[PDB]
UniProtKB/Swiss-Prot annotation, chains A, B, C, D:
InterPro entries per UniProt: Allophycocyanin_b, Globin-like_sf, Phycobilisome_asu/bsu, Phycobilisome_asu/bsu_sf
A biological process term (GO) from this entry: photosynthesis
Source species of the chain: Synechocystis sp. (strain ATCC 27184 / PCC 6803 / Kazusa)
Alphabetized Pfam families for the sequence: Phycobilisome
Positions contributing to (2R,3E)-phycocyanobilin binding: C81
Family note: Belongs to the phycobiliprotein family.
Post-translational modification: Contains one covalently linked phycocyanobilin chromophore.
Compartments, as annotated in UniProt: Cellular thylakoid membrane
This protein's name: Allophycocyanin beta chain
Swiss-Prot record, chains E, F:
Coiled coil: none
Portion of the full-length sequence here: 196 to 249 of 249
Subunit and partners: Part of the phycobilisome, a hemidiscoidal structure that is composed of two distinct substructures: a core complex and a number of rods radiating from the core. This protein is part of a conventional PBS rod (called CpcG-PBS) with on average 3 stacked phycocyanin hexamers (PC, CpcA and CpcB). Linker CpcG connects the PC stack to the thylakoid, the hexamers are linked by 1 copy of CpcC1, 1 copy of CpcC2 and the stack is terminated by a single copy of CpcD. Ferredoxin--NADP reductase (petH) is also part of the complex.
Annotated knockout phenotype: Decreased growth rate, decreased energy transfer to photosystem II. Decreased accumulation of phycocyanin (PC), loss of the phycobilisome supercomplex and major phycobiliproteins ApcE and allophycocyanin. A double cpcG1/cpcG2 deletion has even less PC, but grows slightly better than this single mutant. Unable to perform state 2 to state 1 transitions (i.e. cannot transfer energy to PSII).
Residues making up the signal peptide according to the UniProt record: none
Function of the molecule: Rod-core linker protein required for attachment of rods with the core of the major allophycocyanins in phycobilisomes, plays a major role in light harvesting. Although able to transfer energy to both photosystems, this is predominantly a PSII antenna. Involved in state transitions.
Subcellular location: Cellular thylakoid membrane
Curated annotation (Swiss-Prot), chain G:
A Pfam family annotated for this UniProt entry: CpcD
GO aspect biological process, one term: photosynthesis
Name recorded for this polypeptide: Phycobilisome 7.8 kDa linker polypeptide, allophycocyanin-associated, core
Transcription regulation found in the keyword field: no
Topology term for the membrane: Peripheral membrane protein
Entry keywords, A to Z: Antenna complex, Membrane, Photosynthesis, Phycobilisome, Thylakoid
Organism name: Synechocystis sp. (strain ATCC 27184 / PCC 6803 / Kazusa)
Curated annotation (Swiss-Prot), chains H, I, J, K, L:
Protein name, entry field: Allophycocyanin alpha chain
Function field: Light-harvesting photosynthetic bile pigment-protein from the phycobiliprotein complex. Allophycocyanin has a maximum absorption at approximately 650 nanometers.
Localization terms from the record: Cellular thylakoid membrane
GO BP terms: photosynthesis
GO cellular component annotations of the record: phycobilisome; plasma membrane-derived thylakoid membrane
Source species: Synechocystis sp. (strain ATCC 27184 / PCC 6803 / Kazusa)
Keywords for the protein's UniProt record, in alphabetical order: Antenna complex, Bile pigment, Chromophore, Electron transport, Membrane, Methylation, Photosynthesis, Phycobilisome, Thylakoid, Transport
Family annotation (Pfam families): Phycobilisome
Residues noted as binding (2R,3E)-phycocyanobilin in the record, renumbered to the chain: C80
PANTHER family (alphabetical): ALLOPHYCOCYANIN ALPHA CHAIN (PTHR34011:SF2), PHYCOBILISOME 32.1 KDA LINKER POLYPEPTIDE, PHYCOCYANIN-ASSOCIATED, ROD 2-RELATED (PTHR34011)
Membrane topology designation: Peripheral membrane protein
Amino acid sequence: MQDAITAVINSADVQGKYLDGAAMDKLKSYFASGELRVRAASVISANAATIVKEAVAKSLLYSDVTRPGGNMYTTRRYAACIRDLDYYLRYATYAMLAGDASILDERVLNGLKETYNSLGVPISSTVQAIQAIKEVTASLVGADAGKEMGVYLDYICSGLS
Amino acid sequence: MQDAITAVINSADVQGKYLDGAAMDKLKSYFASGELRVRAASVISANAATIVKEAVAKSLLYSDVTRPGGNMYTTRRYAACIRDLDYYLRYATYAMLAGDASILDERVLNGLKETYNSLGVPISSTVQAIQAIKEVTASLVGADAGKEMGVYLDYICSGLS
Amino acid sequence: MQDAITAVINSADVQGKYLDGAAMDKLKSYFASGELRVRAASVISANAATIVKEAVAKSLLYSDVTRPGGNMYTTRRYAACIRDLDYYLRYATYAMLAGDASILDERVLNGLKETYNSLGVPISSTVQAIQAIKEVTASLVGADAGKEMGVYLDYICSGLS
Amino acid sequence: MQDAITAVINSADVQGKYLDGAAMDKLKSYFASGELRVRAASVISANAATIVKEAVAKSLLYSDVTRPGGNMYTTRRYAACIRDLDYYLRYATYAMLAGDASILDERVLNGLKETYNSLGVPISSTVQAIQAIKEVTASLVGADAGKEMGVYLDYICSGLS
Amino acid sequence: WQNEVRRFIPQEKKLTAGNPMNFLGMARSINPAANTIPKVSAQNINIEASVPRR
Amino acid sequence: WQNEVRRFIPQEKKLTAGNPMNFLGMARSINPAANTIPKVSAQNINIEASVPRR
Amino acid sequence: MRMFRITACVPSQTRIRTQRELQNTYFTKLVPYDNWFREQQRIMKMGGKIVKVELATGRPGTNAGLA
Amino acid sequence: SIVTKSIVNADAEARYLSPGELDRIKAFVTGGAARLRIAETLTGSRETIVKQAGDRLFQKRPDIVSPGGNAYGEEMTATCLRDMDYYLRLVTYGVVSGDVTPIEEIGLVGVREMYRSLGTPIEAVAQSVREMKEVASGLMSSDDAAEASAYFDFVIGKMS
Amino acid sequence: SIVTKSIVNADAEARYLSPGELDRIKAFVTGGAARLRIAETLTGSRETIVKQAGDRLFQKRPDIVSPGGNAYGEEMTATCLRDMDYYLRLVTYGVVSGDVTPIEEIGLVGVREMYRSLGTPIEAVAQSVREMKEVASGLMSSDDAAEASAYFDFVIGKMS
Amino acid sequence: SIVTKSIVNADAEARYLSPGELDRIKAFVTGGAARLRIAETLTGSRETIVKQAGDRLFQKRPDIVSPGGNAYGEEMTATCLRDMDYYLRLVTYGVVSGDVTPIEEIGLVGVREMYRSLGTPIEAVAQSVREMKEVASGLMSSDDAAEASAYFDFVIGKMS
Amino acid sequence: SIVTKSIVNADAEARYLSPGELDRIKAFVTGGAARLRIAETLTGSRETIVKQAGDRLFQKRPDIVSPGGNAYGEEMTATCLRDMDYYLRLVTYGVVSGDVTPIEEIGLVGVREMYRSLGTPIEAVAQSVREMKEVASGLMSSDDAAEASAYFDFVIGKMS
Amino acid sequence: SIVTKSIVNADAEARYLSPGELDRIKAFVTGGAARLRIAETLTGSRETIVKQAGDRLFQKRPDIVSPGGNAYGEEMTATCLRDMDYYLRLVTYGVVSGDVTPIEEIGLVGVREMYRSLGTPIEAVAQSVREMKEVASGLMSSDDAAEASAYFDFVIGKMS
Ligand SMILES: *[C@@H](C)[C@H]1/C(=C/c2[nH]c(/C=C3N=C(/C=C4\NC(=O)C(CC)=C4C)C(C)=C\3CCC(=O)O)c(CCC(=O)O)c2C)NC(=O)[C@@H]1C
Ligand SMILES: *[C@@H](C)[C@H]1/C(=C/c2[nH]c(/C=C3N=C(/C=C4\NC(=O)C(CC)=C4C)C(C)=C\3CCC(=O)O)c(CCC(=O)O)c2C)NC(=O)[C@@H]1C
Ligand SMILES: *[C@H](C)[C@H]1/C(=C/c2[nH]c(/C=C3N=C(/C=C4\NC(=O)C(CC)=C4C)C(C)=C\3CCC(=O)O)c(CCC(=O)O)c2C)NC(=O)[C@@H]1C
Ligand SMILES: *[C@H](C)[C@H]1/C(=C/c2[nH]c(/C=C3N=C(/C=C4\NC(=O)C(CC)=C4C)C(C)=C\3CCC(=O)O)c(CCC(=O)O)c2C)NC(=O)[C@@H]1C
Ligand SMILES: *[C@H](C)[C@H]1/C(=C/c2[nH]c(/C=C3N=C(/C=C4\NC(=O)C(CC)=C4C)C(C)=C\3CCC(=O)O)c(CCC(=O)O)c2C)NC(=O)[C@@H]1C
Ligand SMILES: *[C@H](C)[C@H]1/C(=C/c2[nH]c(/C=C3N=C(/C=C4\NC(=O)C(CC)=C4C)C(C)=C\3CCC(=O)O)c(CCC(=O)O)c2C)NC(=O)[C@@H]1C
Ligand SMILES: *[C@H](C)[C@H]1/C(=C/c2[nH]c(/C=C3N=C(/C=C4\NC(=O)C(CC)=C4C)C(C)=C\3CCC(=O)O)c(CCC(=O)O)c2C)NC(=O)[C@@H]1C
Ligand SMILES: *[C@H](C)[C@H]1/C(=C/c2[nH]c(/C=C3N=C(/C=C4\NC(=O)C(CC)=C4C)C(C)=C\3CCC(=O)O)c(CCC(=O)O)c2C)NC(=O)[C@@H]1C
Ligand SMILES: CC1=C(/C=C/C(C)=C/C=C/C(C)=C/C=C/C=C(C)/C=C/C=C(C)/C=C/C2=C(C)C(=O)CCC2(C)C)C(C)(C)CCC1=O
Ligand SMILES: CC1=C(/C=C/C(C)=C/C=C/C(C)=C/C=C/C=C(C)/C=C/C=C(C)/C=C/C2=C(C)C(=O)CCC2(C)C)C(C)(C)CCC1=O
């Protein structure tokens, strides 16, 4: 995977040059953002279970999926969705802390589409749950940390879409 | 897989017949090839690293392929393409000593184009890699043995190309 | 395909928001650049026929590409090469008028890379040819207009990269 | 279109009979003429642009036909005149090789008098250009070939006139 | 007693098919007669009868 | 009446970071100290004690 | 190649077009012989009327020498 | 004629004939004497070639002249023999012309529809023209046999 | 004329010449005095402009006036001066009209076929028209020179 | 290759090879010995043929090497002679194939774009290949020179 | 980098980054100014750092340039300078990133295969990187010397 | 020994030795006299061949004995002579065995790690064993050259 610090390194090394003023400025910008990134990651890790709980409550619970026959039925499947939402949140936090959404398409988005197609998972329902998680985290971590988390979660959703 | 001897055997056996005169004469032809093929195999096995070394040194080495941006860059991909050339040389030697290309398209051509496209490997650059391998082998195996080396390596390129 | 103005309008429409201060500042920037873009367009349509001449002369003449065996030998190949350079020049001028890379994504770079790969034409030599036409157009269109032309040409190279 | 062969074949078949003596004699005459036909065709094809070039130079250039007011003024009208002369020469060659003017009025004489009269083309100037083609072709091919081309050119001028 | 100095610049490249090298010397044998510098005024040509009136 | 006689050779491709051409003069700047030809023949060495034994 | 020339007036019976249409309403065109039957049938189907037609190219009644 | 095909193919490219077409015309005008000799030989004995071919077809396809047959009856057999003579004349036309354009333009375009209207087993007609080819080859020189049989056989294949 | 181009473009979509074009025709008719003045400026000094235009062209490309070239003889160079005068008049027509449609309708459609039938190196024609443009820019008063540069440059582009 | 566009023409019509095309292939294969002889005679005499053709081209039209010309450079003359070699190889390939397929499909399609990009006059190279034809007919047997000059006429006219 | 390393380590256990990882990233991002300045310092002396690095290496192991060595002439010594600049750039990448993994991604995976297929003594390469470390620490502050020496030392260890 | 290899393969397949294996050991046992002759010749002339091949290796690669190389110092060149003696004895062992198992497991498996620990340029040892090959071929008969060269080629390829 790639982050904001090694993204500049790869970008400079593809042409083989050293780190010039532009690369230096990009690194300083990432280091400036690192404060908010670390604070947001710590806060999200502290409240991951509650965040996924609230996102499930306002986006999936008491609907057709949770009713019998639905894909939320068969409590093993409900735990599978809880685990999937936890995975999405944790990998979004990874991408936000890294500063680049390359881990998302390398450890999350890789093969997810046909995974859900074979399992018959509601892709739009999962997308809606992801925006619910985005809204919940944005209301708990602030405006800018929520900004970055929403950016990476929306990248995940667009990969899903 | 199958070679010329196995080719005549299964060609006779599919019709459920013994060795007719046609199979008799192609077996005579393959036996006449005989010591030449095995001597070429031994000479190839002697300086086995040398063919790939000077093949890299002639075409791929010292170019935009091996420079930054090119797929040759970094030590990992350099060693990876060296391993690829080693596969190609060993399997060309196997096909030569067998006299048939069934080993190549049963062990190389199956999915190799698509597996390079997945890694985005330059098909053309590999093409002149095996090309340079052709004369590097011909300079050590002679003309006729070098000619058949060229034929089999051209088959490898065509399957890859 | 959308220009800078239509790109801003579509971006505002995506959020369902009016043109805020960033919208007007970007619009005024494009309006200021319109004078330079129009004059550069006139200058480049002035010499679109001749400019590609020295663009290819200092890039793809008397080299391995033009000779037999090269992918630019034969009148069809040379004609298609000069026509491809003409297409790149014309469409980059189109983008410079529009001031957006949207046209290149769908009308130039869309399907061009694998088209060249199937054709077997040297993509790297095309990259150097587009760089050469970059300096050639910068010579006639000026520095600032030259930079605007060069950014689009480098975008074409990166897409073809 | 009827040539020296298909004309005889149709004349025989309309009466529903085989090749009689007169058809024998006329087919023999055409067969004898065929050698000179092919030779003159090669002669005309060798210098196909030439005869029209000196014909226009000697009968059309530097006159009121091409001066302001003449129908051959302007590049579009000049190119149209040149294309018409090339068409006339090519169809004269075709009628030469066929031995009959049936194609001559089947392809190039289809309403051309009406077309030129509607467009206001000078019939006298067209006939003069046709004659200028005539002596150039006669000089380039020979005496009898020149005469047999002149008969078809006279067919052209009569159809136009 | 020496080492073939490893060349990464492809020096000593034979003139292959496509190179006009193989004609340069023979062009030297041809030695084309370049026409002299024309001395045309292009300033005193009264263009009213110098243009043909055919 | 200056004329541009364009030569045979293709325009020399611009040097890149990967190519050691930009280091080539640096090598001549280095001028590394080579080594004389070692004058040993190995015939007068006898492998019973000339080999280390410690 | 034994072509017909046809003048015909085919009107529009389903849509009211706001662009100029004399070019495709009343027209004289050269139709090949092998395509004349199909063109006539199609023009008849669309309500068009074949105002006039004549063998512009070729000679009628020729058994051979048609191409 | 072959020349008509040459100008047709050239005008399709809007250009003078290629060296191949001019070579074709030269060879055809040179060999026109032999081609006309072959045509005269076929024409002179035509009532014999058509006759023997019709008889041979009658042995090979007795159903044609069997009761209930399309050619059953003296008049229907005469009509079939007239068809045979027509197609022999068309083959002579093709031989003199140098190509198979007159053959198609006269007796090969829409022949299936015509014989469907007449209800004829066109395969038997192809067998009949094969018999005509054999009879013509029997009474004609071996070298001329190839040229005559080429056109006879094109007729057979298009009508087969 | 810009009016004719606007009419044709509006007819392409069956519109009523939307105000975004009507203001342009209004500005053209208002400012036509400057274009007319440029017209007299180019008309009066046409002889000199074409003359040193040919001088510069020959200095950069003496092939045409050379004995091997197309313009040799002092009558063919007369023809080049005549053609340059024609294209100068065409550029005047374009500048007075307001657009490039008269230029295409007069001396740009089929020009390649015109100069291929004459052996003219049309690239040399483009160079000569460029030098005419430079001479006009020297004679024209800056912004008027820039305005006429549109027509001269369009002739350059279509000529090559 | 005669057979290649013969088969292409047959496939375009969805039909087998006609008797005329078959006979043309017959004559081509039977007379291929002369074509191979001409291939050898052109390959062997390449240097003298190109030398005399280029010299007579230069002496007829010095403007190609005159000041400001596209071949003023000493290297430009050798590049032109390389073009001469290329077209000579194309003519050899075409005479070998018995057909003008390889000439058009190697060095004719888009040559006008070639020369507009590089500025070389088309008429000049047409005259050069005319000189090639003249010298080749000088060095070649009369009957063989007939076909060689026919193919040279094809290339000169089509490229003219 | 260090962030990538922490993310990978957390992903291995399928958990969020621990407070130790978080405040390590905290300290790294806070102190990144010094790391970027040291990377700038190493970049600036690149030409000289390579220069005396290679000089000291050759004086220490002349066999690599001596008769029989991998880099005999100025050409192969230039190639050594090229690789030398490669690994200087790698050390700079490590310093800016703060973690050795990009070096592993670039110039440490399969390096033994590289320098066995090339015949280069990898021990000499290690000595050259050690000369990197010595001279670079000579031309920078002691604490900054240790900060860069971490990555130079890691490259040295991966060498041997 | 090939007998051990055949037994190992048969035991892996859990089958008695196939006719191919039986013929293999039969040919080996019948031809053991030649292998013993090769072993005796190598043992008798070992001291001269090793010295000559070491001299030729020095002539190819003088840097190995230059002041700073692994072989520099008479101790460190006598150790090369002893290593070449060891490899020659291993080749002699393999010649009398019929397979390369003793070569593989006495000096081949793990040779790279040993020569990395000692710093020896393994490619130099490959050149040295090559020189041993030419020396043995020179001193030994033509027909046995193939047999000895097979083992030398195997050792070179594996240890290269
Ligand atoms: C009171 C007796 C206890 C209690 C129950 C309780 N449950 C919910 C909500 C849900 N219960 C389920 C359970 C299942 N779904 C299944 O598919 C299966 C069988 C395969 C089970 C057992 C689910 C999925 C939900 C939420 C979704 C939905 O209701 O459709 C609630 C309400 C929770 C809320 O916040 O809305 C309650 C009260 N809770 C207790 O404390 C008692 C022990
Ligand atoms: C001399 C009297 C004629 C002439 C020659 C001329 N040619 C060039 C340059 C080129 N010509 C070619 C030609 C071909 N490429 C092909 O693939 C084929 C065969 C299939 C041909 C015939 C090419 C590729 C070039 C460019 C590179 C090269 O030289 O090989 C020049 C140079 C012109 C310039 O400005 O570069 C010249 C002078 N020019 C004439 O005017 C005469 C007709
Ligand atoms: C110099 C003191 C030592 C030495 C080095 C040496 N290297 C080469 C050639 C190459 N080195 C590389 C290495 C890399 N390329 C990459 O992209 C990467 C990561 C960025 C690495 C590590 C390559 C690819 C080459 C091949 C040529 C090329 O760069 O394209 C040589 C020359 C080899 C030859 O024979 O040409 C040398 C001398 N060798 C020593 O003995 C010194 C200890
Ligand atoms: C070398 C000739 C060219 C080149 C290639 C290149 N290959 C890879 C990576 C792989 N190549 C293979 C090869 C094979 N897989 C098969 O099944 C067969 C038949 C046995 C072959 C030959 C494989 C397996 C890999 C991936 C696994 C691995 O690394 O061992 C790379 C690296 C791709 C990357 O970094 O993702 C490259 C560069 N590159 C050149 O420049 C040569 C022209
Ligand atoms: C010139 C810099 C290089 C080069 C060119 C070259 N291209 C082709 C063929 C094609 N090029 C294109 C590309 C486009 N067509 C479009 O309409 C557009 C949209 C913007 C693009 C970019 C296509 C589609 C083709 C294939 C069809 C064609 O024949 O044109 C060729 C010939 C390929 C062949 O097999 O004949 C060539 C030679 N070649 C080089 O070596 C230069 C680096
Ligand atoms: C001169 C720098 C270049 C050149 C030109 C050239 N042209 C001619 C002859 C004619 N050109 C035309 C046609 C036009 N000229 C125009 O300006 C326009 C206005 C739209 C048109 C249509 C005509 C009519 C002629 C004369 C023929 C005729 O009377 O119909 C020549 C002389 C040709 C001749 O054979 O006399 C020349 C030299 N040629 C070059 O080489 C220069 C690059
Ligand atoms: C030149 C020798 C004389 C001349 C010619 C001239 N012709 C036109 C216009 C047309 N000419 C034709 C004729 C044909 N078109 C064909 O396709 C063929 C058969 C293959 C022929 C014979 C046609 C159809 C037109 C009108 C359509 C078109 O543009 O092609 C013009 C232009 C008239 C105008 O008003 O534009 C001219 C000048 N004029 C002379 O004075 C010469 C004697
Ligand atoms: C109305 C007051 C009078 C009338 C009109 C009428 N016209 C049609 C049909 C057509 N009218 C035209 C005319 C034009 N089309 C154009 O593009 C232009 C040039 C800009 C003109 C002048 C055409 C072409 C048609 C036929 C095609 C079409 O309509 O698309 C009709 C309909 C006739 C019918 O039965 O289809 C009518 C009624 N009729 C009156 O009685 C009024 C006096
Ligand atoms: C095979 C074949 C066919 C042909 C088949 C054929 C050959 C068919 C032909 C069949 C024939 C020969 C039919 C004739 C029938 C005669 C009748 C009914 C007359 C009766 C007379 C009467 C009642 C008069 C009685 C009387 C009256 C009352 C008087 O007043 C007093 C006296 C008198 C006796 C005159 C087809 C055509 C079908 C197909 C092709 C094909 O191959
Ligand atoms: C090439 C090569 C190498 C080998 C390299 C070599 C050969 C290295 C060897 C280098 C040598 C021979 C160094 C000599 C050092 C002697 C010193 C410092 C003694 C000073 C004495 C003093 C000051 C005494 C003064 C005095 C005092 C004070 C008194 O009291 C009074 C008198 C007295 C004089 C005694 C390597 C091994 C590195 C690698 C492999 C390889 O091949």
